[PDB]
Design a protein around this ligand. Structure first.
Ligand SMILES: CCCCCCCCCCCCCCCCCC(=O)OC[C@H](COP(=O)([O-])OCC(O)COP(=O)([O-])OC[C@@H](COC(=O)CCCCCCCCCCCCCCCCC)OC(=O)CCCCCCCCCCCCCCCCC)OC(=O)CCCCCCCCCCCCCCCCC
Ligand SMILES: CCCCCCCCCCCCCCCCCC(=O)OC[C@H](COP(=O)([O-])OCC(O)COP(=O)([O-])OC[C@@H](COC(=O)CCCCCCCCCCCCCCCCC)OC(=O)CCCCCCCCCCCCCCCCC)OC(=O)CCCCCCCCCCCCCCCCC
Ligand SMILES: CCCCCCCCCCCCCCCCCC(=O)OC[C@H](COP(=O)([O-])OCC(O)COP(=O)([O-])OC[C@@H](COC(=O)CCCCCCCCCCCCCCCCC)OC(=O)CCCCCCCCCCCCCCCCC)OC(=O)CCCCCCCCCCCCCCCCC
Ligand SMILES: CCCCCCCCCCCCCCCCCC(=O)OC[C@H](COP(=O)([O-])OCC[N+](C)(C)C)OC(=O)CCCCCCCCCCCCCCCCC
Ligand SMILES: CCCCCCCC/C=C\CCCCCCCC(=O)O[C@H](COC(=O)CCCCCCC/C=C/CCCCCCCC)COP(=O)(O)OCCN
Lengths: 80, 129, 77, 63, 62, 65, 78, 129, 65, 78, 78, 78
């Protein structure tokens, strides 16, 4: 998949179909971060860097900083 | 006008079927069987819970105030708490500015009668606005 | 860069002073114009990115062509 | 620098004349300069061209 | 060269990497500064400078 | 899938559409008023120009060249 | 003497001249697709790579036309 | 300043203990044990559900539109439906009026330049407002 | 009852208080401006009265009773 | 000394120039249908895909021609 | 000073320039009816389909011709 | 008599004339890609190589337009 011009790398298969069919999948050994692993969404279960900090919260933080940048002088104007 | 409506309905139906949440699917099936609305039911449940949790909010507020005032909050202060406090400060500043703008009911400060900008007010194209 | 500056100025103008049309009955015209501006923005940035590298390539190629015009190669025996 | 030049030229031609204004007035002037910047080549041309019959001060106001 | 790295699948995943957290913060600033300019520069009480015809850059550069 | 016992979503869309149509009515009214006032100011400036020209003509006659 | 004159309507003239820059742009795009058809007739299995190259050529030619159109609109608003 | 705070906290605690809802009490106990906030958790659950039910809302809208258009809705029309429709009409009228006021950004219609009320605009006490 | 891991409610109250204080700042500013303009209009009316009285006095002298 | 002059008729001249660009468009069209036919004769089996690509050629060239025509009409009424 | 002029005769000049737009248009048609012949000799069995496509191209070019003609006539009787 | 006259609007006219240069540049670029297609359908094994040369050609041909465009800016901003 892509996010703007950033494309997610994909690992090339190395096993042949015959060898691959003989592989037994045991997700019990897998880490909890990667279970029901999906190439189209590998980071769905990945932990947050800061607990409770959503992406929307950061976006809104930036929006508020922009509003402050544009509106601070309207409330605390300064002379030349 | 009808093909577009059918296409939109089909797309939303596909997306609804796609989600693999047991609770959401169960609620959707139950409401479809009963002919009721799941979203409105969710809204009513939420408002009921918030109505029943108001005094819980008050108790939590007093507990948090005691926690902060006692100094226990700053004893275990970390960088994450610093990030949260910076977010908090930013919201406070933006809310103060918005409150000032709403309080004076104007984006810009009003012009005093002795200011030389009064001419600008007199020469408004539309005095109604 | 002149073209980029002028287009950015136009985009700022229409975005700031005509976005209210989203709440009006002529919203479709503004949405069409805005989509066209976004397309033009992306196209200009891609074109500039490609052109800068290509122009450096040609700048070095001219110098190497000067050098190659006077080089004589011997054959090993 | 451009903002200060506009303030000085439009309100006396001297820094002291600008400082005679209040902070709110300076805010208004600077925001008008921002408006002019955002219009640039596409905004209305009455922001700098005085229509005939306009009662506002002209270029020889301070001369 | 755009070879690889963490790529969030959707908006909700931007919080899974500090660098993309900073990126989404910056995007918020970028996109939210435009509404602020709409509100500020299309305000009812915004008034053009009375002395706007006293001087302009057009006469200066000419 | 039984027939719906409530029409909440249709009502919500209708609420939005009603508010939007009211907004359009108000916007049209305001735009018309703004155009009227722009024309009025233009007429005022034209009258001022004519008055100034008449004053200049009278002053020219007083000059008597 | 030191006479000086400014004319208002001249920006309509220059603008029109810039529009003529779209004559060869138009044509050029034409030409590309023309050749494309012949190519797709000569090598019908290459109906996608040739299409991609034609799109690239149109994009570059449209950039040139756009360079000209910026001047055309800018003089018209000066 | 402290006695009042203690009294308010005690009252809210009594009211919180009074409610006899098993689910609310269970959630409160669990969050108190874990030290988390129940109200905020309820809000997040609600927003998540509404985010996952958007396309359900779209499908329901199209189903309701088909139900109304097909004439089946009017076949079983009763007095209760009449009451609901009157409520619906009242909300539509009020929303239209509010929309008009917001659209013109004025409670009253703007005054035309040829009206004799222009004097009122000229004689405003505060031209800024 | 463990210590709170989040301070959401205190933050909400602080948000309300910040907005309220901003509202008070704006209200004070607007009220001061309104008082200034009221005084200005009163002065204008007083000046108009004085001008009318002076005109009436000059007309009285012209009457010459 | 200053002399500001507003010549009204000049807006006609520029308009006409903006129409000249149409030539570079129209000719453009013919070229695409000048070669399409040949392709249809070379590979009659692709009478359909070639037609669609030529129509796309017409669209892109035609779009350049409306961009010029907008300048032509704006200066005719202003 | 403030000065304004209205040169009526200019309305002819623009009308002439728009006519030049036909120069390409006509030429374009020729190109079509050139290649058509070369296409009909190679594949005489496809005269009907090629003729229909040529008529299509002629109509598309005539559209631009009528646009330019409309501009010319408007600037002539205005 | 002897008058030093300074007309202001002329800088538009010249600017527009410079844009006419692009009419060639644009067209020229199209020609390249035209041949490119006819060259890729005649020896597809070299497509990549051919593409590279085309890009080189585009970069050389476009360069010239820039020259003209520069002049326009110089006269348009002076
Ligand atoms: C200057 C000062 C002036 C002051 C004036 C006075 C001020 C007011 C004073 C008081 C007056 C008296 C009280 C009146 C109250 C009226 C409101 C009320 O009660 O609401 C409850 C009522 C629901 O009550 P209910 O029926 O009992 O609900 C039962 C359940 O609880 C249902 O529960 P639930 O689970 O459903 O809960 C969710 C529900 C409840 O949510 C809410 O409660 C919402 C908030 C309620 C208050 C809203 C007030 C609105 C007033 C006007 C706008 C002001 C700003 C509001 C900001 C809201 C932000 C969210 O959500 C909604 O209602 C959703 C509504 C939006 C639907 C969106 C659908 C859009 C589809 C478009 C498709 C187009 C396709 C075209 C294809 C064409 C092809 C050719 O909801 C509404 O009325 C919603 C109104 C929304 C109006 C929005 C208008 C925005 C402006 C126009 C759009 C412009 C931008 C977009 C343009 C796009 C191009 C087209
Ligand atoms: C995939 C691409 C991604 C980006 C790629 C890179 C960039 C490329 C360039 C373009 C980027 C587009 C922008 C990014 C996308 C943003 C939208 C999004 O996805 O958000 C998901 C996000 C959910 O994601 P999440 O991470 O799961 O969040 C979890 C929960 O939100 C829970 O979060 P929490 O736990 O943190 O909760 C925090 C807290 C915080 O909650 C809040 O504070 C709620 C926000 C309230 C409004 C404050 C400001 C909102 C910002 C508006 C201005 C935005 C300007 C920039 C937008 C640019 C868009 C292009 O929440 C609450 O307490 C609940 C809220 C209850 C209050 C509701 C009532 C609000 C009344 C507001 C009053 C003020 C109104 C004005 C008038 C006032 C007059 C007195 O959905 C929303 O929340 C959407 C709500 C707002 C929708 C409209 C926003 C602006 C327009 C966005 C258009 C985007 C177009 C994209 C097209 C894609 C097509 C393929
Ligand atoms: C002219 C045009 C100008 C346009 C300017 C620009 C317009 C805006 C453009 C965008 C700007 C950038 C974006 C900025 C967004 C900022 C807002 C935001 O994000 O909010 C989310 C933020 C929560 O985000 P979060 O921390 O991420 O939440 C995490 C969880 O989601 C938490 O989830 P949860 O479960 O907690 O969800 C519920 C939560 C979330 O709810 C919401 O989201 C609320 C709606 C959000 C938007 C609010 C915008 C506010 C802007 C100013 C006001 C405009 C009208 C707003 C109407 C709201 C109606 C509900 O509720 C609250 O936030 C509650 C807040 C109220 C607390 C009430 C406590 C009062 C205690 C008083 C005790 C006094 C005792 C004195 C004893 C003295 C003894 C001596 O909430 C707020 O900031 C709430 C602000 C509320 C301000 C109200 C001020 C009203 C005016 C003053 C009061 C006057 C009447 C009463 C006087 C009484 C006498 C004292
Ligand atoms: C005894 C002790 C007493 C202590 C009392 C303490 C009282 C404190 C009172 C409140 C103080 C508030 C200070 C901060 C606000 C200052 C506002 C200000 O000056 O604004 C003017 C300035 C602007 O100054 P300006 O007015 O010159 O700029 C205007 C410019 N024009 C005119 C062109 C528009 O505003 C800003 O620059 C705002 C920038 C944002 C501020 C918030 C930053 C938050 C952090 C963001 C970065 C980190 C993100 C990380 C994300 C990823 C994480 C992994
Ligand atoms: C206290 C605020 C309450 C909020 C209620 C808002 C209700 C508004 C409903 C109608 C809005 C449309 C009105 C149409 C006409 C607007 C005209 C205008 O711009 O007037 C401004 C009012 O406009 C503004 O101030 C705001 C402009 C737009 C603000 C945008 C708000 C935030 C938008 C966020 C966009 C982010 C992306 C979202 C994408 C969604 C759509 C794809 C005031 O000035 P005037 O008196 O007309 O004269 C000024 C000249 N001296």
């Amino acid at each position: 998949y892509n996010m703007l011009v950033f494309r997610d790398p994909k690992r090339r298969p190395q096993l042949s179909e015959e060898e691959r069919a003989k592989v037994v999948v045991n997700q019990a050994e897998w880490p909890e971060e990667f279970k029901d692993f999906d190439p189209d969404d590998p980071y769905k279960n990945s932990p947050e860097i800061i607990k409770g900090m959503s992406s929307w919260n950061l976006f809104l933080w930036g929006v508020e900083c922009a509003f402050i940048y544009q509106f601070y002088e309207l409330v605390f104007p300064k002379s030349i | 006008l009808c093909n577009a409506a059918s296409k939109v309905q089909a797309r939303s139906a596909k997306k609804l079927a796609a989600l693999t949440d047991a609770g959401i699917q169960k609620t959707i099936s139950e409401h479809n069987a009963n002919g009721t609305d799941a979203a409105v039911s969710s809204t009513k449940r939420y408002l009921a819970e918030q109505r029943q949790l108001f005094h819980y909010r008050v108790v939590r507020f007093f507990d948090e105030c005691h926690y902060i005032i006692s100094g226990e909050y700053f004893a275990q202060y970390t960088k994450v708490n610093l990030i949260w406090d910076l977010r908090f400060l930013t919201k406070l500043v933006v809310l103060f500015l918005i409150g000032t703008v709403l309080g004076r009911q104007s984006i810009f400060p009003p012009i005093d009668p002795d200011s030389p900008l009064v001419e600008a007010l007199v020469t408004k194209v539309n005095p109604n606005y | 860069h002149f073209l980029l500056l002028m287009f950015f100025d136009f985009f700022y103008f229409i975005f700031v002073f005509f976005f209210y049309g989203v709440f009006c009955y002529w919203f479709i015209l503004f949405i069409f114009v805005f989509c066209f501006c976004l397309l033009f923005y992306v196209f200009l940035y891609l074109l500039d990115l490609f052109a800068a590298i290509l122009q450096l390539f040609i700048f070095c190629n001219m110098i190497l062509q000067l050098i190659m015009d006077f080089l004589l190669f011997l054959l090993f025996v | 620098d451009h903002v200060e030049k506009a303030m000085i030229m439009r309100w006396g031609g001297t820094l002291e004349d600008v400082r005679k204004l209040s902070a709110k007035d300076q805010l208004r002037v600077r925001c008008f300069t921002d408006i002019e910047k955002l219009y640039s080549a596409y905004g209305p041309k009455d922001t700098y061209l005085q229509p005939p019959g306009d009662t506002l001060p002209g270029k020889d106001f301070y001369r | 060269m755009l070879l690889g790295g963490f790529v969030p699948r959707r908006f909700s995943q931007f919080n899974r990497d500090p660098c993309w957290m900073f990126f989404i913060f910056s995007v918020g600033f970028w996109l939210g500064e435009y509404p602020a300019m709409m509100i500020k520069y299309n305000a009812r009480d915004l008034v053009y400078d009375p002395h706007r015809y006293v001087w302009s850059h057009h006469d200066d550069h000419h | 899938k039984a027939a719906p016992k409530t029409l909440h979503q249709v009502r919500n869309v209708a609420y939005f559409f009603a508010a939007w149509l009211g907004v359009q009515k108000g916007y049209i009214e305001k735009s018309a008023n703004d155009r009227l006032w722009v024309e009025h100011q233009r007429k005022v400036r034209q009258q001022n120009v004519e008055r100034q020209q008449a004053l200049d003509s009278i002053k020219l006659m007083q000059q008597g060249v | 003497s030191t006479v000086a004159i400014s004319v208002q309507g001249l920006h309509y003239v220059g603008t029109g001249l810039a529009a003529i820059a779209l004559a060869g742009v138009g044509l050029g795009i034409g030409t590309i697709f023309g050749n494309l058809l012949v190519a797709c007739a000569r090598q019908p299995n290459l109906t996608k790579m040739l299409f991609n190259y034609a799109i690239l050529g149109f994009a570059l030619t449209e950039a040139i036309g756009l360079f000209a159109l910026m001047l055309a609109f800018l003089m018209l608003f000066s």
